[PDB]
Amino acid sequence: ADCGLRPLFEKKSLEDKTERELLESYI
Amino acid sequence: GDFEEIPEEYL
Amino acid sequence: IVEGSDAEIGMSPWQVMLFRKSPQELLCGASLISDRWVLTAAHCLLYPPWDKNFTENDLLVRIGKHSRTRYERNIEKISMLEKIYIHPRYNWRENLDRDIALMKLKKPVAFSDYIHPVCLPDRETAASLLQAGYKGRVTGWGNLKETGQPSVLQVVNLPIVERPVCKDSTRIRITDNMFCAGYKPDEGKRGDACEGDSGGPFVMKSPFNNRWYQMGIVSWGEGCDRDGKYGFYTHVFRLKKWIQKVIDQF
Ligand SMILES: COc1cc(C(=O)N2C[C@H](C)OC[C@@H]2CCO)cc2nc(N[C@H](C)c3cccc(Cl)c3)oc12
Ligand SMILES: *[C@@H]1O[C@H](CO)[C@@H](O)[C@H](O)[C@H]1NC(C)=O
Incomplete structure (x- = not known):
């Protein structure tokens, strides 16, 4: 149920430095 | 010896 | 990487x-x-x-x-x-x-x-995200170039490539259980897996539910980061x- 959610990122609502590059590609 | 030694319990 | x-x-x-x-x-x-x-x-x-x-x-x-x-x-x-x-x-x-x-x-x-x-995809995840141009992320401790080795885990983001381009890049027969990823020579960005990265994950972050899904497994390439070549990844959902x-x- 908690797969794919990173304790240091999604769980605290912090983004890593390049996950936006992934999002911008999902057109 | 590129890799640091592991505790002996794991080997 | x-x-x-x-x-x-x-x-x-x-x-x-x-x-x-x-x-x-x-x-x-x-x-x-x-x-x-x-x-x-x-x-x-x-x-x-x-x-x-x-x-x-x-x-x-x-x-x-x-x-x-x-x-x-x-x-x-x-x-x-x-x-x-x-x-x-x-x-x-x-x-x-x-x-x-x-x-x-x-x-x-x-x-x-x-x-x-990490999550494994279901059919809808795959259909939504496994699209030419959509980027995934590859991570590993493998070599820094084809012919040294990183101090810490390396990361690169790479676009999924159109199936005809993948096929046309190699003499090897490419199957429906594989996809390829990497930049084209014209694109002016680079990146690939390399020796030691095999078996590691190609991940994508779903924009629907904000979870990471493992879409691929680092499988093989002809050298590392060569122009006109790509990385071939095991299609996780096809083998689910x-x-x-x-x-x-x-
Ligand atoms: C047996 O594992 C491998 C084989 C080869 C190969 O040279 N070959 C197999 C291909 C199917 O046929 C051609 C010929 C056969 C040589 O035995 C290349 C390989 N590259 C890797 N891994 C590295 C990390 C890599 C590099 C760049 C992109 C990706 Cl996605 C992965 O594993 C390989
Ligand atoms: C690999 O090793 C296993 C057991 O050690 C053996 O049964 C198997 O046949 C081997 N396969 C090879 C050498 O292809």
Whole structure:
């Protein structure tokens, strides 16, 4: 149920430095 | 010896 | 990983290092999919052309790592293998079709800030995200170029490529169980996996539910980061019936 959610990122609502590059590609 | 030694319990 | 950058701390908490006991060396990447199951590339364990035939007792699973070589006391966890399961129609002879294997650990791994499983896609995830141009992320401790080695885990983001382009890049027969990824020569950005990254994950972050999904397994390329070549990745969703079958049986 908690797969794919990173304790240091999604769980605290912090983004890593390049996950936006992934999002911008999902057109 | 590129890799640091592991505790002996794991080997 | 060629032309990537240092991972952030906790950026890829599903990253697993397969570590050979003797000689002590990086065997491959892998990923954590539950507290007892790890996914990798079959060729990391079995590849007769290179005399590779590892058994359970030959290696360890190291989770939670960042540094390639240090023993990361109180951060990493080291697990022993109970059993290896290689896809029974893994085609090491022709083209590494179904380059996938599961490993069951002897004991559950405890989750932490540094250790957490990735999701596996279902059909709708695959159909939504596995699209030419959509970017995924590849991580590993493999070589920094084709012909040295990183101090810490490397990361690169790479676009999925159109199937005809993938096919046209190689003389090898490419199957529906594979996709390819990487930049085109005109694109003016670079990056690839390289020796030691096999078995590691190609991930994508769903924009629908904000979770990371493992879409691919680093499988093979013709060299590393060469212009006009691409990386071939095992299509996780296409092999998910097998994954579910093994996990349900064992
Ligand atoms: C048996 O494992 C491999 C084989 C080869 C190969 O040279 N071959 C197989 C291909 C199917 O047939 C051609 C011929 C056969 C040589 O035995 C290349 C390989 N590259 C890797 N892994 C590296 C990390 C890599 C590099 C760049 C992109 C990706 Cl996605 C992965 O594993 C390989
Ligand atoms: C690999 O080793 C196992 C047991 O050690 C053996 O049964 C299997 O046939 C071997 N496969 C090879 C060498 O292809």
